[PDB]
Amino acid sequence: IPQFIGRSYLTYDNPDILKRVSGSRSNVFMRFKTTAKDGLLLWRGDSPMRPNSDFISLGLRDGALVFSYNLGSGVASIMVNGSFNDGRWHRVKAVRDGQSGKITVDDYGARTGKSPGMMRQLNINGALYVGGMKEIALHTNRQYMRGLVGCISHFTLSTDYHISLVEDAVDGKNINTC
């Protein structure tokens, strides 16, 4: 949904979106914009039991995009820093190779993020939330408890599957006026 204003979350149902993320690769091209200091833009991750939940993420911690792919055995906390808290559009691309990927911001440079723990290929079930989640505090992550704002845009996942953010969803709110 373009033009988030509040805690507007968004889930996904299509079994094609549910599959390109799970594997030995991942891509994102979120062309977001924000005026906050935290938030969540993608939270595909199965029912979080004891911390290992094979979760992927793309946060905006205090002006620091943090690609947080996990495999259970080893966390990853890639990071960039700038003026992302306030301003205008920004082009992300969170490539993965099963154990290694970038967090390439617009022009800052490819801050590579080598961070496996032992293994690869464990991306598992769950819906693909974009822009938030109906309730996120109770979830085991407990890092993106607020900041769920922005005005999101083009989201071509896996470098092929161009996705529309309202045409393939089942939930959400407030398409316009941000």
In the complex with another protein, the residue whose CB is nearer, 29 or 140, is 29
Closest separation between CB of residue 173 and another protein, Å? 29
Q: Say if CB 128 and CB 17 are below 8 A apart.
A: yes
Q: How far is CA 176 from CA 3, 8, 28, 173, in A?
A: 5, 12, 23, 9
In the complex with another protein, the residue whose CB is nearer, 106 or 171, is 106
Closest separation between CB of residue 88 and another protein, Å? 14
In the complex with another protein, the residue whose CB is nearer, 29 or 46, is 29
In the complex with another protein, the residue whose CB is nearer, 51 or 82, is 82
In the complex with another protein, the residue whose CB is nearer, 79 or 145, is 79
CA proximity to 92, closest of 36, 144, 44, 154:
154
Closest separation between CB of residue 108 and another protein, Å? 6
- Give me the residues that bind another protein (CB under 8 A), please: 25, 27, 29, 91, 93, 95-97, 100-102, 104, 106-110, 112, 114, 156, 158-160
| Cα angle, residue 80 at apex, residues 74 and 81 outer, rounded to 5° | 135
Euclidean distance between CA atoms 148 and 37, whole angstroms: 10
Q: Around Cβ 147, how many Cβ atoms within 10 Å? A: 21
Q: Tell me, rounded to whole angstroms, the distance of Cα 140 from its chain centroid.
A: 16
Euclidean distance between CA atoms 109 and 76, whole angstroms: 19
Closest separation between CB of residue 163 and another protein, Å? 13
Closest separation between CB of residue 152 and another protein, Å? 16
Euclidean distance between CA atoms 101 and 126, whole angstroms: 22
